[PDB]
Design a protein around this ligand. Sequence first.
Ligand SMILES: Cc1cn([C@H]2C[C@H](O)[C@@H](COP(=O)(O)OP(=O)(O)OP(=O)(O)O)O2)c(=O)[nH]c1=O
Ligand code: SF4
Ligand SMILES: [Zn+2]
Lengths: 66, 1010
Amino acid sequence: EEAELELLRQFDLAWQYGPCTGITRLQRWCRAKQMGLEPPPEVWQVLKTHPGDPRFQCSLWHLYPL
Amino acid sequence: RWLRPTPPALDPQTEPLIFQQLEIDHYVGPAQPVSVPVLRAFGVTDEGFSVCCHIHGFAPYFYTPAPPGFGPEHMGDLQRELNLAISRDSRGGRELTGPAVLAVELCSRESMFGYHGHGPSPFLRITVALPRLVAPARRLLEQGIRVAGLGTPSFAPYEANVDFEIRFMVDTDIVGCNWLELPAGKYALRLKEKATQCQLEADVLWSDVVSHPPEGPWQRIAPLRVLSFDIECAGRKGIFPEPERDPVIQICSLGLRWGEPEPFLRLALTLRPCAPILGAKVQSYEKEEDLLQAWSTFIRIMDPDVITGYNIQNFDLPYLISRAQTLKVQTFPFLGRVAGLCSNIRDSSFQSKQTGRRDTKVVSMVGRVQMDMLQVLLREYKLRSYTLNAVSFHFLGEHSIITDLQNGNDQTRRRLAVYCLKDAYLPLRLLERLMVLVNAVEMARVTGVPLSYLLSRGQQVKVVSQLLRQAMHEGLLMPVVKSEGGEDYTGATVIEPLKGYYDVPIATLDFSSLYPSIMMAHNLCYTTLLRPGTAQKLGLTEDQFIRTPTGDEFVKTSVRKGLLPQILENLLSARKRAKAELAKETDPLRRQVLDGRQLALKVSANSVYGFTGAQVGKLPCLEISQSVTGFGRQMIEKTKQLVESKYTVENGYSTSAKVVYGDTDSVMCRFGVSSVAEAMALGREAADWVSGHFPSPIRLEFEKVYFPYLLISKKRYAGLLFSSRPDAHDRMDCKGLEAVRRDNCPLVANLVTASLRRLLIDRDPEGAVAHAQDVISDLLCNRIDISQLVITKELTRAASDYAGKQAHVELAERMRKRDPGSAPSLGDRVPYVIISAAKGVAAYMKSEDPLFVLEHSLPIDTQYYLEQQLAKPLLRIFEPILGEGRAEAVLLRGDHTRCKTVLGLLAFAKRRNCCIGCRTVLSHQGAVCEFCQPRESELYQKEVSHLNALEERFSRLWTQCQRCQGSLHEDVICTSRDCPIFYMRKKVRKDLEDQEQLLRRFGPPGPEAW
DNA sequence: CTATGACCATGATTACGAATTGC
DNA sequence: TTAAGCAATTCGTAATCATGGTCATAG
Ligand SMILES: Cc1cn([C@H]2C[C@H](O)[C@@H](COP(=O)(O)OP(=O)(O)OP(=O)(O)O)O2)c(=O)[nH]c1=O
Ligand code: SF4
Ligand SMILES: [Zn+2]
């Protein structure tokens, strides 16, 4: 923790995985894996050792009335 | 980056200098030629080199009458006035003045105020060494000691104490933004070892210069250099940025030469490594010290003339200065032209009854000129919101996210830089499109004040300047009268209306430039005001003086010519030339900006008259003001008597006309015919007929024909506008009504405009009733956007708002938990909406910020908006066409439509289902009721045509943001509170969320797993 | 157990300041 | 040391004044 919260914030702004501020984080991870762009096997391995926490399993701007 | 061209081959003993000045400056100096105040003048050549000019040998002075004794006509006492008193008790009278070369001079002059005769009198001219010694001398010659050998017994008053640079410019006939010439052999370039940073540095004596009056070929403008910039900072969540914790991360700059239709420089300086942008240079640094140093070096090397931006004074420059002070970078705050001078932040305030009161900071830059476009908008224009988005929509047509666009990758930083460059580009487009700078240069040339005074001062320095420039040509001196305080006088008359609705044409006749032509054609001035005794015992009344309705006597023009007639005549010709230029444009926005130019010149001419009556001012003469408004009242009642008396049934005409209205310059006479051609013909005959009963330039003129007409009260009416006949109609006129004020809701102003449209153009009251019914019904059914509900009010001086409790003051002074660092200040506008509660004693307890009621979802008081905002303007407008059954008609059109209203503990819901047909709560989830079952195909048919229309509204809105943003492949981030698009795109998601779930009460129309 | 006016409570009228626009 | 004028209409809040519903106790 506090190092796992920057890896996800770095996965969320890389443009080669998609334009993602409307959906979940694991849905975008599996969308890129289907098309197989290059999802890395570390943004998966922190979404498995946690429960349904809203500060891991949510996009950066999931507040913010946009 | 790009440098100025190289000054090749100037030789001073053969060649002159011809350059155009921008700024002047005062400077107390050593290195005297073998006075101490020497003058600086900065400017540009006809090619593009930068020229500093040092001017020597000038010292301030004033005048004082020589008292009638044996002293000031005897040279021993003149030089004894120069000589100091060596006594011990004269330490209060010869120290703070001390040994200064005040000197003694004898001259024959006159005082301005009044008319005593054509004969002058001896005055003493007193020079002083320094400009910062005329204040203690004034404190030592009037209330100080003037016992000096009995030469000047106390007291003799001081006359013509004015400003130093203004006295220089009045002396040598140099005006703002003028062409200046140093002749051959008069100037020395290498006499001044370089202390400033310009290219050419001359060193001239103050009698060598030649001033060219701007006219003919001397009416050009040199190629100046204009810069605009913008900055970005990275803040915390909630917390507004603070110059001791939040770094400056990006600076972006645009630069152009004036006269060329595109820029030539486009630079962006960032603080992490970035990605390239086509059309601009990009440099990157790993520390902020390098970024601030790089910007200071660029601003020294490019060396711009003018610096613009948007809110750069109150946000950008002091943030940069404080941030450079915190990080210990010594070489930043030297931004000016003088090589050894650092810059400093200093507060200032301005207040008037015309613009209100505003408090600004200033930052010192010598040589360079500042034009914040926000202050120009706030001074000239009266708008509803003053945000960059709001004025860019009105004229053209468009913090915590940024901190994670900067802590990310380099394409995010490239997106941030493109956003910042668009921000830094918008005020240039506004400056060149609105004709700001051309009008500022013409104002400085017509009035004679510098170019920095049109952003800091009011309308007094300009009329003082023009009066002094006209006073040197006949030899008069101005006095100092100051009084606190006189009384008011009686203003203008308004004629009593015949209120109602008219449907026969009324023609408008008015006088053009009324008060300046009264002051012109009856020879009224300071310098020809006759005191009550000095007529006596001469008895010549006829054609030597006249008498006014307030009571004064004023000398005819066969003896004197006043000074205010000539200043007014120059201003009137300048405005006439501006209108003659405006009569040949075809573009609409260009036509209104030339209308803005001529409006400014008419405001200047009327502020000449308003100077006289200002008892808190510099020279008031309320006798003149009273004579002006007395002549106004007399002439308008003359107009009304004449118009209603001549064209009558016995005088061969058709119908005796009757005046329905008149307001101090205009007359709205109702003629009787219902043919617009015959009304126009008789109205032109009437205007030209009545004008032949006056001196000149007094003239009445036809202006319009209203058909139909609607008169509600004093200063409240409406009508439809005819300019010609085959030019059928132009537009509506809404004088005073609820559609042009800014104290209300957009909903109410829109309803008033649409009602007058349906009522005056189509003449259908039934569509008007149906329209107002639909507006009220959609209000009560909760389908009205919250853009239409926002009220704005101006937060003025804090003590008047201490005196009585208001709504906007209560919202502003109540801070937020998120941000006690961004809140309304004095002078701005506070927006709010009114929510529903049960505290009926106070409408100042129900007000809330629009963004707070957005994010926290508070309900709206529909009864407040129904009976307090809407109802009474409608009862103003709709009654005069009918009786009081019309009040009952709209309150009954409410009554058929008032019966249709839409609706901690809120979490503990039960969510009772309800029948879609007859609203009966019941156990189970099926949509239809057991009694209302045979009718279910019709109840499914009903409401799927509602889902169908919500689907069509989702798609038109959420793809409009993609075209306003620019991109089709990346996310939208725009929470622009002045866009209707925002929060209208938020509610359709919830309408669709609700209406989709109501149709799943019905089963599915098929399987889905096959 | 029952008249009478004294007592609390709620609504109609006036006054004045603030805001903004027309000449 | 610094500042162009007056006329008029509209709306909100507190204070002033009118009037009825309870009630409390003397008959
Ligand atoms: C607008 C305005 C008018 N007035 C006075 C002076 C004017 O002579 C008188 C008439 O008002 P206006 O009709 O507004 O101005 P005007 O008649 O001088 O010029 P024009 O007809 O070309 O538009 O009202 C002022 O004193 N100060 C002002 O700001
Ligand atoms: S909400 Fe959409 S349409 Fe409105 S300003 Fe923002 S981007 Fe433009
Ligand atoms: Zn039912």
